[PDB]
């Protein structure tokens, strides 16, 4: 019986062995479906094929954590990990570029500031 | 045999030859034809020895120049007013009008020839002397560019008779 938090302990050698172990038990269940069985047996296929999908998830989860650990704060990150969003969102200019002004429009903005003014009662 | 006459060339080779034919064949106007009238290679060697003396600095030399000023005397008096070749058409046309430029030396090759059609009259109307030199690339080497019109507004004391 598998739970996904327990597999986050186990090693990159160990995960592979377990994945293989389940696939044997999944195969020996398909044989019993074909030849002769009861419905007591054929429910156990549902447990184990969700077990397999957990072990693929956890393996791939560790695969990506080491990549993101390594490429952290670095340019030319691999395409596999690279922040999807929309196509349009990816395009555009950074807030800094849209925000940035010329040396001319700096001077007109700077020297005429936003004044808190009021009208008397 | 050598069949280099009879070769079916690419279009780009055929264009850059049929230009040079077509500019011989047509009646050229006097103004455009001005640059057929050029210095001799002995006359041009007399400039390129002169103009190499007044060579404006490399971009790497601006660092080393500025390290000295970064203040050994005091500000801009760390040196004298430095003399050199002035270059780029849109500076040098202003420098003809306000009447500083001693000599104003020009390329025959310049590719959009409209750029330099007017300049020989400008110089003649103001009484500035001018030359024409074979190769815009040769003038580029003095300035540190790839490639028209170079001028001397100012000289040393030693080289002024020459």
């Amino acid at each position: 019986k598998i739970r996904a938090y327990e597999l986050r302990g186990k090693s990159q050698k160990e995960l592979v062995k377990q994945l293989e172990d389940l696939k044997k038990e999944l195969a020996q269940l398909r044989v019993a479906k074909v030849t002769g069985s009861a419905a007591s047996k054929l429910s156990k296929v549902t447990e184990v094929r969700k077990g397999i999908a957990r072990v693929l998830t956890v393996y791939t989860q560790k695969q990506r954590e080491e990549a993101r650990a390594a490429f952290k704060g670095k340019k030319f990150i691999p395409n596999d990990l690279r922040a999807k969003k929309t196509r349009a969102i990816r395009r555009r200019l950074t807030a800094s570029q849209t925000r940035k002004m010329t040396v001319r429009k700096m001077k007109r903005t700077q020297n005429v500031p936003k004044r808190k003014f009021a009208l008397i009662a | 045999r050598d069949l280099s006459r009879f070769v079916k060339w690419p279009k780009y080779i055929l264009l850059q030859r049929q230009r040079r034919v077509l500019m011989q064949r047509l009646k050229v106007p006097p103004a455009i034809n001005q640059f057929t009238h050029t210095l001799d290679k002995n006359q041009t060697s007399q400039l390129m020895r002169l103009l190499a003396k007044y060579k404006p600095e490399t971009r790497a030399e601006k660092k080393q120049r500025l390290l000295q000023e970064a203040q050994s005397a005091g500000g801009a008096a760390g040196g004298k007013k430095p003399v050199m070749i002035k270059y780029g058409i849109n500076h040098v046309t202003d420098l003809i009008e306000i009447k500083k430029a001693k000599l104003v030396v020009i390329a025959h090759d310049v590719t959009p020839v409209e750029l330099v059609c007017f300049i020989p009259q400008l110089c003649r109307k103001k009484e500035v002397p001018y030359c024409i030199v074979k190769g815009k690339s040769r003038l580029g080497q003095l300035v540190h560019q790839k490639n028209p019109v170079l001028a001397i507004d100012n000289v040393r004391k030693e080289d002024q008779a020459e």
């Binding site: 990159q12 592979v16 994945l19 696939k23 999944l26 195969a27 398909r30 044989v31 019993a32 479906k33 074909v34 030849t35 693929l56 393996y59 560790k62 695969q63 990506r64 080491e66 990549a67 390594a70 030319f76 990150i77 691999p78 395409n79 596999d80 990990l81 | 045999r1 050598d2 069949l3 280099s4 009879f6 070769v7 079916k8 060339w9 690419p10």
Partner: protein
Amino acid sequence: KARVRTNVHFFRPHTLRKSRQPKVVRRCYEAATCTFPKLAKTDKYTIVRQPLTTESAMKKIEETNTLVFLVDPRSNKRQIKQAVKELYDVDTQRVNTLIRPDGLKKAYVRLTSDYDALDVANKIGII
């Protein structure tokens, strides 16, 4: 002044072409100190799905030394030979192969004269 050329035709020159060398990797399986390498798409298990058991299939196992299996329809005849060798540890003479109306490959696999099929069919439990 110019090169002495012999052919009347102008041909395109030959240039250097660099192979790709794409700076930084596309997918993170293939990197320095990756250490979780990619698990395989086609294992031995996903090729050889399951044996058949029927009146037609069980007649063959006795006599002609021949096991019948249902296999993945994309699979190759050379893969089935090697996948059967990996699973049950038995060497194959001659695979034949056939796509049922379903969309399922049935592979008839005659085993080598060294081995016996009724040993292997009891080991699996197709019996």
